Design an enzyme around this catalytic site. Structure first.
Site, PDB file in Angstrom:
ATOM      1  N   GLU A  47      56.288  27.290  44.671  1.00 40.19           N
ATOM      2  CA  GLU A  47      57.057  26.220  45.274  1.00 40.19           C
ATOM      3  C   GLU A  47      56.653  26.048  46.725  1.00 40.19           C
ATOM      4  OE1 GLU A  47      61.300  24.708  46.897  1.00 40.19           O
ATOM      5  OE2 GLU A  47      60.588  26.759  47.227  1.00 40.19           O
ATOM      6  N   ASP A  96      59.460  31.240  44.533  1.00 45.75           N
ATOM      7  CA  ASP A  96      60.362  30.500  45.395  1.00 45.75           C
ATOM      8  C   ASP A  96      59.985  30.652  46.880  1.00 45.75           C
ATOM      9  OD1 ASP A  96      63.005  29.087  45.963  1.00 45.75           O
ATOM     10  OD2 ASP A  96      63.334  31.022  46.946  1.00 45.75           O
TER      11      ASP A  96
END
EC number: 2.4.1.7
Length: 505
Positions: A233, A193
């Site tokens: 990401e 993330d």
């Protein structure tokens, strides 16, 4: 390597009765052969804080309200599991940060957290601070007291998400505790993330810099060592995604979602052809995610406006206005400064709503997604062809909640009756069963009007033809995708993926 099968992206509690067990039951009883893996969005302690799981107090502890690691182990028997490693930040209510609030420089975790002085020990010019890349206006600092002394703590996202020093001993140990927990809990894949934000350095943008590259390669090697495939990401200027992809197992294809909205609303496919030509093929493909639609992911570089995107910026502007029109103002109430948001310029709408709920357009977009090289993921709202949730948006004032509806089992079953949902389920089964998709990919194009994607496999082949010019308009009912394929039973064709979904022999 990641299995080449369609995955579901879901919250454990927003699909079914509200637990990992129920989510698991829903997958097994209602999506067997449709979704063979699942990215469970953060389910750690707590799942319902400042940023819906992404501010963990204890990343290694399942929220006891959702279930246990035993539930994750049970699920792994039938599904490969992706989870997040939240490597950039953690909750300010973590024991570690609380210790620093209490003891300041005497805390053993003091080095674990970034402050303005961490990065700028001799101070900063306006240029230094202005040059830090941001997803929304405002500096990435907020006030906290360290043993009574006011400090400016680095916060990329909410002020409750305090950024860790990923180059510190304590920070690194914390990240490896996350990797160890996931390895030991039968997780297959890890999503890093916000990893583009993970490295800070004075006088740089602190986003996808050479220091970030080093961080990403180090995290990837820690993944490989534990048998965990690493997906990063990164929402960035498209060239930066193409560049970084050769260094990791997977990147997202974040260009495709707005490229398809553009194609379906204007008829133009040349930008899709160009992207097909140059994109990283070690991809995880999406249309929707749990975040907003990253329309700027196809635009010019925000830190250098002279580096142009996959379409002119004027086309991005038009795309945004089109979504707003298609949702009759719904997306305007959720997007940007109109609601709470981390990303000023992402557009908040379900993907189905962004297309004006046009079934032929939506199934065509999924077909294209599934035919580009990469492992496909379907977000759970999109799996149920879900519309904007205005009541939830009104209740929380969180912009992204327009696309995070809570689906009871009863509502799931109701949506499974819809032709467009049946079509998506069938399309995903097809994408999972035909060996063409494990073979060789090629495409041809008819100058900005038509593009045909072909896979040839050991015992099958398939060609998807995409021609959005055929059915422009939100109320259009004309199919804009056609499918031809060969399997055990010979040649087959569908000219309407809703009325006549494909089934592999």
């Amino acid at each position: 390597a990641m299995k080449n099968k369609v995955q579901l992206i879901t919250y454990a509690d927003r699909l079914g009765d509200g637990t990992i067990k129920s989510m698991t039951d829903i997958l097994r009883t209602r999506f067997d052969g449709v979704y063979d893996g699942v990215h469970i969005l953060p389910f750690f302690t707590p799942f319902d804080g400042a940023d819906a799981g992404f501010d963990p107090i204890d990343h290694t502890k399942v929220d006891e309200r959702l279930g246990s690691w035993d539930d994750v182990a049970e699920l792994s028997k039938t599904h490969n599991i992706m989870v997040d490693a939240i490597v950039n930040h953690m909750s300010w209510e973590s024991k570690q940060f609380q210790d620093v609030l209490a003891k300041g420089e005497e805390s053993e975790y003091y080095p674990m957290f970034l402050t303005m002085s961490s990065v700028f020990p001799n101070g900063a010019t306006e240029e230094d601070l202005a040059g830090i890349y941001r997803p929304r206006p405002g500096l990435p600092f907020t006030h906290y007291k360290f043993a009574g002394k006011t400090r400016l703590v680095w916060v990329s996202f909410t002020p409750q998400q305090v950024d860790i020093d990923t180059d510190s001993d304590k920070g690194w140990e914390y990240l490896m505790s996350i990797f160890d927990q996931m390895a030991a809990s039968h997780v297959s894949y890890i999503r890093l993330d916000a990893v583009g934000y993970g490295a800070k350095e004075a006088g740089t943008s602190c986003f996808m810099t050479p220091k970030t590259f080093k961080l990403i390669s180090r995290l990837r090697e820690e993944g490989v060592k534990r048998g965990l495939e690493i997906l990063i990401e990164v929402h960035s200027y498209y060239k930066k995604q193409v560049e970084i992809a050769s260094k990791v197992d997977r990147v997202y294809d974040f260009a495709l979602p707005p490229l398809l909205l553009h194609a379906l609303s204007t008829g133009h496919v040349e930008p899709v052809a160009h992207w097909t030509d140059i994109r990283p093929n070690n991809a995880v493909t999406v249309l929707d995610t749990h975040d907003g639609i990253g329309v700027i992911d196809i635009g010019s570089d925000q830190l250098d406006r002279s580096l142009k995107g996959l379409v002119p910026d004027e086309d991005v502007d038009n795309l945004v206005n089109t979504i707003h029109a298609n949702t009759h103002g719904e997306s305007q109430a959720a997007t940007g400064a109109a609601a709470s948001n981390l990303d000023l310029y992402f557009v908040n709408s379900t993907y189905y709503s962004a297309l004006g709920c046009n079934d032929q357009h939506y199934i065509a977009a999924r077909a294209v997604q599934f035919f580009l090289p990469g492992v496909p993921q379907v977000y759970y709202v999109g799996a149920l062809a879900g519309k904007n949730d205005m009541e939830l948006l009104r209740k929380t004032n969180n912009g992204r909640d327009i696309n995070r509806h809570y689906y009871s089992t009863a509502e799931i079953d109701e949506n499974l009756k819809r032709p467009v949902v049946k079509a998506l389920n069938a399309l995903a089964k097809f994408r999972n069963e035909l060996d063409a998709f494990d073979g060789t990919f090629s495409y041809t194009t008819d100058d900005d009007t038509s593009i045909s994607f072909t896979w040839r496999g050991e015992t099958s082949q398939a060609t998807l033809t995409f021609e959005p010019k055929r059915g422009l308009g939100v109320d259009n009912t004309t199919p804009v995708a056609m499918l031809e394929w060969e399997d055990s039973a010979g040649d087959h064709r569908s000219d309407d993926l809703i009325a006549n979904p494909p089934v592999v022999a």
